[PDB]
Design a protein around this ligand. Sequence first.
Ligand SMILES: Cc1ccc(CS(N)(=O)=O)cc1F
Length: 284
Amino acid sequence: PKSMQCKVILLDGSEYTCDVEKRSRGQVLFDKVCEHLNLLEKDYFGLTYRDAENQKNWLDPAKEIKKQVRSGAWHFSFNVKFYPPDPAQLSEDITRYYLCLQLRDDIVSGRLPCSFVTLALLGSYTVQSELGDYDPDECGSDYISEFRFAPNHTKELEDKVIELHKSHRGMTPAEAEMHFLENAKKLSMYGVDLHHAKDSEGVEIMLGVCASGLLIYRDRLRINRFAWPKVLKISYKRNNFYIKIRPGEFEQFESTIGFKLPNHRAAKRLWKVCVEHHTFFRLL
Ligand SMILES: Cc1ccc(CS(N)(=O)=O)cc1F
């Protein structure tokens, strides 16, 4: 049996290395990573890899790893795939912990936009979880945390994290993580996967995929929302992605909305994440 070495970037930034038989399906590697992480609520999560364009792709657990990575390195990341709309309802604290680590990267990266006060509040719960009770000894008027909290760090943000951290005395890591999630879950881009596209007139839009449905972000005043029940059918053809929407009270037949993606691969990727999130929705 010939085995391929796999390297997985974990959500704490560390690297897990293991071997799988070269013809292994994704699920084999994923099971090894989740056992390493002591994770039981596995189906919220998945592995990604980067292709030659350095675009992220979900490793399909049902398909051979080699038919997905193809010419690329067997290098993966462990990530949240399905963001729980209600993290309080997860059965295990360790699940909420990994979701916190993913969200911290969502924030620092700018994928999850956040007001100054939300950045500071989330940062304060992370510090409480990571270091425990506020200690003046390792925090002078000039203090700067090791923790990355935001896409752009300022002294004013560091000071506000410390002010809020003082208020959390006696909070355990599980409690601070639950508070972090109660706040993060409310953010307008929580669990939203954004895809670049053009509408049928060639105007640049963003399509967002999430547990509740599909968003068409046209401009700040114009954001079309289609809850999953309103979506009859999804499809891709060449560089085009189509959604069929149930007729409204003033409609006789369904409507079709068409979108132009950059390339055939970007259309197929969008279709697959839509199908997957639609199934997640049907499980809620
Ligand atoms: C798709 C999907 C199914 C089930 C669960 C719950 S679990 N098995 O992780 O505890 C999460 C999911 F995201």
